[PDB]
Amino acid sequence: GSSGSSGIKNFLYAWCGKRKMTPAYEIRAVGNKNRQKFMCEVRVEGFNYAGMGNSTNKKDAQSNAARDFVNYLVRINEVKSEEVPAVGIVPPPSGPSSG
């Protein structure tokens, strides 16, 4: 649908809510004024790490930040990767794109 998706943002929020916590997001604007980009960080109380993301928009930047903090929860074995949803974002091809 035209609103995109929110599965990894909802997964971190639901994981926090099953543990009596709430995730805290933090955002910065970067790049060209007409062709703007955004960076995102996300943190949770009692954890020293911050998951990091970026994109052309705040929603995809939050989804990358959420995926990297949920990945950290697998690096410390507080979450199994088998439960974690796909981020919904893919990189551009490494070849020419000028025409």
XYZ file of N, CA, C and O in Angstrom:
396
model
N 0.830 -1.226 0.000
C 0.000 0.000 0.000
C 0.853 1.260 0.000
O 2.040 1.220 0.322
N 0.261 2.405 -0.343
C 0.971 3.687 -0.541
C 1.576 4.297 0.742
O 2.421 5.190 0.670
N 1.187 3.809 1.921
C 1.753 4.183 3.228
C 3.047 3.421 3.592
O 3.672 3.723 4.614
N 3.472 2.446 2.773
C 4.666 1.624 3.004
C 4.405 0.510 4.020
O 3.414 -0.216 3.919
N 5.298 0.364 4.995
C 5.236 -0.654 6.057
C 6.026 -0.222 7.311
O 6.837 0.706 7.263
N 5.778 -0.874 8.451
C 6.279 -0.453 9.778
C 6.673 -1.649 10.672
O 6.751 -1.514 11.894
N 6.912 -2.832 10.088
C 7.028 -4.101 10.819
C 8.196 -4.168 11.794
O 8.035 -4.680 12.896
N 9.361 -3.627 11.428
C 10.552 -3.626 12.307
C 10.483 -2.553 13.405
O 10.878 -2.802 14.543
N 9.887 -1.396 13.101
C 9.588 -0.331 14.068
C 8.600 -0.846 15.130
O 8.835 -0.718 16.332
N 7.532 -1.513 14.682
C 6.554 -2.177 15.541
C 7.162 -3.353 16.327
O 6.786 -3.559 17.478
N 8.130 -4.085 15.756
C 8.768 -5.223 16.423
C 9.622 -4.771 17.612
O 9.497 -5.346 18.692
N 10.435 -3.718 17.450
C 11.199 -3.139 18.560
C 10.268 -2.563 19.636
O 10.472 -2.808 20.823
N 9.213 -1.854 19.228
C 8.235 -1.276 20.154
C 7.471 -2.347 20.958
O 7.317 -2.216 22.173
N 7.045 -3.434 20.305
C 6.377 -4.572 20.941
C 7.320 -5.369 21.857
O 6.920 -5.756 22.953
N 8.583 -5.561 21.459
C 9.608 -6.195 22.292
C 9.849 -5.404 23.584
O 9.848 -5.975 24.675
N 9.979 -4.078 23.470
C 10.060 -3.170 24.619
C 8.810 -3.273 25.516
O 8.937 -3.425 26.732
N 7.611 -3.269 24.923
C 6.329 -3.311 25.642
C 6.070 -4.628 26.382
O 5.419 -4.621 27.425
N 6.641 -5.744 25.914
C 6.596 -7.052 26.594
C 7.578 -7.141 27.782
O 7.533 -8.099 28.559
N 8.443 -6.130 27.930
C 9.485 -5.991 28.957
C 9.289 -4.732 29.832
O 10.184 -4.373 30.599
N 8.144 -4.042 29.708
C 7.771 -2.813 30.443
C 8.671 -1.593 30.110
O 8.903 -0.722 30.954
N 9.182 -1.530 28.875
C 10.048 -0.469 28.332
C 9.395 0.234 27.126
O 8.379 -0.231 26.598
N 10.039 1.306 26.645
C 9.669 2.082 25.444
C 10.953 2.507 24.715
O 11.857 3.009 25.390
N 11.072 2.325 23.382
C 12.246 2.749 22.624
C 12.227 4.265 22.388
O 11.164 4.872 22.243
N 13.416 4.869 22.327
C 13.615 6.303 22.120
C 14.445 6.559 20.852
O 15.615 6.184 20.775
N 13.825 7.210 19.866
C 14.419 7.541 18.565
C 14.957 8.988 18.530
O 14.465 9.868 19.244
N 15.948 9.242 17.676
C 16.661 10.517 17.544
C 17.072 10.711 16.076
O 17.637 9.802 15.472
N 16.770 11.869 15.475
C 16.871 12.102 14.015
C 17.645 13.391 13.682
O 17.569 14.383 14.414
N 18.358 13.368 12.547
C 19.121 14.479 11.960
C 18.839 14.588 10.455
O 18.777 13.574 9.760
N 18.708 15.809 9.936
C 18.594 16.097 8.500
C 19.978 16.399 7.892
O 20.780 17.107 8.505
N 20.256 15.872 6.698
C 21.564 15.941 6.011
C 21.388 16.047 4.488
O 20.300 15.802 3.965
N 22.452 16.422 3.771
C 22.475 16.480 2.302
C 21.901 17.773 1.707
O 21.721 18.779 2.394
N 21.638 17.735 0.399
C 21.173 18.868 -0.409
C 19.776 19.379 0.011
O 18.884 18.594 0.328
N 19.563 20.701 -0.024
C 18.316 21.355 0.412
C 17.063 20.917 -0.378
O 16.004 20.681 0.207
N 17.183 20.775 -1.701
C 16.099 20.327 -2.590
C 15.935 18.790 -2.601
O 14.812 18.289 -2.705
N 17.040 18.049 -2.439
C 17.109 16.578 -2.417
C 17.607 16.098 -1.044
O 18.733 15.618 -0.897
N 16.773 16.306 -0.023
C 17.123 16.128 1.386
C 17.207 14.640 1.772
O 16.529 13.788 1.197
N 18.031 14.340 2.779
C 18.225 13.014 3.377
C 18.188 13.100 4.914
O 18.374 14.174 5.497
N 17.963 11.966 5.578
C 17.798 11.871 7.028
C 18.591 10.698 7.603
O 18.659 9.622 7.007
N 19.155 10.917 8.790
C 19.826 9.917 9.623
C 19.029 9.721 10.913
O 18.403 10.661 11.411
N 19.064 8.514 11.467
C 18.319 8.123 12.658
C 19.176 7.246 13.576
O 19.964 6.417 13.119
N 18.974 7.414 14.875
C 19.516 6.594 15.947
C 18.357 6.138 16.846
O 17.367 6.860 16.986
N 18.470 4.960 17.461
C 17.482 4.451 18.431
C 18.157 3.751 19.610
O 19.144 3.034 19.441
N 17.613 3.996 20.805
C 18.132 3.580 22.111
C 16.995 3.043 22.998
O 15.823 3.347 22.771
N 17.342 2.266 24.025
C 16.415 1.686 25.017
C 17.077 1.752 26.399
O 18.270 1.476 26.524
N 16.315 2.147 27.424
C 16.804 2.304 28.800
C 17.374 0.984 29.356
O 16.730 -0.064 29.289
N 18.597 1.039 29.901
C 19.330 -0.125 30.425
C 20.272 -0.795 29.415
O 20.925 -1.778 29.770
N 20.377 -0.262 28.190
C 21.263 -0.748 27.125
C 22.160 0.392 26.621
O 21.678 1.479 26.295
N 23.473 0.145 26.567
C 24.480 1.171 26.247
C 24.673 1.406 24.732
O 25.291 2.396 24.334
N 24.148 0.519 23.881
C 24.230 0.618 22.420
C 23.169 1.561 21.820
O 22.112 1.792 22.412
N 23.438 2.068 20.612
C 22.486 2.804 19.785
C 22.502 2.242 18.353
O 23.543 2.257 17.692
N 21.351 1.754 17.875
C 21.180 1.280 16.496
C 21.049 2.464 15.550
O 20.386 3.444 15.897
N 21.671 2.379 14.373
C 21.847 3.494 13.432
C 21.284 3.181 12.039
O 21.411 2.061 11.539
N 20.671 4.183 11.404
C 20.108 4.107 10.052
C 20.102 5.443 9.315
O 20.292 6.498 9.916
N 19.861 5.402 8.005
C 19.690 6.584 7.149
C 18.898 6.261 5.866
O 18.814 5.098 5.471
N 18.326 7.283 5.222
C 17.623 7.204 3.926
C 17.265 8.612 3.388
O 17.674 9.628 3.958
N 16.465 8.688 2.314
C 15.857 9.918 1.769
C 14.710 10.463 2.625
O 14.220 11.562 2.370
N 14.274 9.703 3.631
C 13.088 9.970 4.444
C 13.229 9.393 5.865
O 13.929 8.402 6.091
N 12.541 10.007 6.834
C 12.633 9.650 8.259
C 12.120 8.233 8.576
O 12.642 7.576 9.476
N 11.133 7.728 7.830
C 10.513 6.413 8.058
C 11.467 5.248 7.749
O 11.655 4.350 8.572
N 12.132 5.299 6.597
C 13.150 4.323 6.205
C 14.421 4.454 7.057
O 15.073 3.452 7.352
N 14.739 5.669 7.521
C 15.863 5.897 8.433
C 15.603 5.265 9.815
O 16.470 4.561 10.335
N 14.396 5.443 10.368
C 13.942 4.764 11.587
C 13.915 3.243 11.422
O 14.323 2.533 12.334
N 13.459 2.729 10.279
C 13.399 1.279 10.040
C 14.798 0.646 10.013
O 15.009 -0.419 10.597
N 15.781 1.334 9.421
C 17.183 0.907 9.447
C 17.783 0.995 10.865
O 18.464 0.062 11.298
N 17.487 2.061 11.623
C 17.939 2.218 13.009
C 17.358 1.136 13.934
O 18.096 0.520 14.703
N 16.058 0.854 13.806
C 15.366 -0.214 14.524
C 15.976 -1.582 14.204
O 16.341 -2.314 15.128
N 16.169 -1.902 12.916
C 16.794 -3.161 12.506
C 18.196 -3.323 13.098
O 18.521 -4.412 13.554
N 19.002 -2.263 13.168
C 20.356 -2.322 13.732
C 20.377 -2.446 15.270
O 21.257 -3.117 15.814
N 19.384 -1.891 15.982
C 19.238 -2.125 17.424
C 18.673 -3.521 17.723
O 19.147 -4.189 18.637
N 17.713 -4.009 16.933
C 17.212 -5.390 17.064
C 18.314 -6.398 16.724
O 18.472 -7.396 17.423
N 19.139 -6.098 15.719
C 20.362 -6.861 15.437
C 21.282 -6.878 16.671
O 21.648 -7.961 17.115
N 21.554 -5.741 17.325
C 22.263 -5.703 18.619
C 21.639 -6.607 19.696
O 22.368 -7.344 20.360
N 20.306 -6.665 19.801
C 19.615 -7.600 20.706
C 19.849 -9.084 20.356
O 19.757 -9.928 21.245
N 20.214 -9.411 19.112
C 20.702 -10.751 18.712
C 22.199 -10.912 19.040
O 22.599 -11.974 19.515
N 23.015 -9.855 18.878
C 24.447 -9.847 19.244
C 24.669 -10.087 20.751
O 25.672 -10.694 21.130
N 23.720 -9.678 21.607
C 23.714 -9.951 23.067
C 22.766 -11.094 23.490
O 22.623 -11.363 24.681
N 22.112 -11.763 22.533
C 21.269 -12.958 22.716
C 19.969 -12.715 23.530
O 19.389 -13.648 24.093
N 19.484 -11.469 23.575
C 18.189 -11.087 24.166
C 17.006 -11.252 23.186
O 15.851 -11.234 23.615
N 17.279 -11.450 21.890
C 16.301 -11.750 20.824
C 16.893 -12.806 19.884
O 18.089 -12.780 19.601
N 16.065 -13.733 19.386
C 16.444 -14.656 18.307
C 16.193 -14.027 16.928
O 15.094 -13.545 16.652
N 17.162 -14.108 16.017
C 17.032 -13.604 14.637
C 15.824 -14.191 13.886
O 15.160 -13.468 13.140
N 15.462 -15.452 14.163
C 14.309 -16.153 13.573
C 12.964 -15.423 13.778
O 12.031 -15.626 12.997
N 12.862 -14.548 14.788
C 11.663 -13.756 15.083
C 11.650 -12.379 14.387
O 10.597 -11.747 14.296
N 12.797 -11.906 13.894
C 12.993 -10.520 13.426
C 12.497 -10.349 11.975
O 12.930 -11.112 11.107
N 11.627 -9.358 11.683
C 11.109 -9.115 10.337
C 12.137 -8.422 9.430
O 13.085 -7.781 9.890
N 11.929 -8.539 8.115
C 12.741 -7.878 7.095
C 12.511 -6.350 7.081
O 11.376 -5.881 7.184
N 13.590 -5.574 6.928
C 13.598 -4.108 6.990
C 12.837 -3.406 5.845
O 12.458 -2.246 5.989
N 12.597 -4.100 4.719
C 11.816 -3.594 3.574
C 12.579 -2.656 2.628
O 11.969 -2.032 1.761
N 13.898 -2.534 2.800
C 14.797 -1.596 2.099
C 15.939 -2.390 1.437
O 16.460 -3.330 2.041
N 16.344 -2.007 0.222
C 17.437 -2.618 -0.554
C 18.319 -1.532 -1.201
O 17.795 -0.473 -1.560
N 19.641 -1.760 -1.348
C 20.571 -0.781 -1.906
C 20.453 -0.685 -3.442
O 20.003 -1.641 -4.083
N 20.879 0.442 -4.048
C 20.940 0.606 -5.499
C 22.084 -0.229 -6.114
O 23.039 -0.574 -5.408
N 22.019 -0.549 -7.423
C 23.055 -1.306 -8.122
C 24.343 -0.486 -8.280
O 24.312 0.736 -8.422
N 25.490 -1.169 -8.273
C 26.828 -0.545 -8.299
C 27.256 0.004 -9.679
O 28.310 0.638 -9.794
N 26.458 -0.231 -10.731
C 26.718 0.226 -12.104
C 26.235 1.663 -12.389
O 25.639 2.296 -11.507
N 26.475 2.183 -13.612
C 26.019 3.503 -14.052
C 24.494 3.663 -13.984
O 23.748 2.703 -14.170
N 24.031 4.894 -13.751
C 22.600 5.224 -13.581
C 22.225 6.598 -14.195
O 21.178 7.177 -13.903
N 23.087 7.149 -15.057
C 22.952 8.505 -15.629
C 22.034 8.583 -16.871
O 21.765 9.680 -17.374
N 21.551 7.438 -17.376
C 20.681 7.327 -18.558
C 20.355 5.877 -18.918
O 21.103 5.283 -19.727
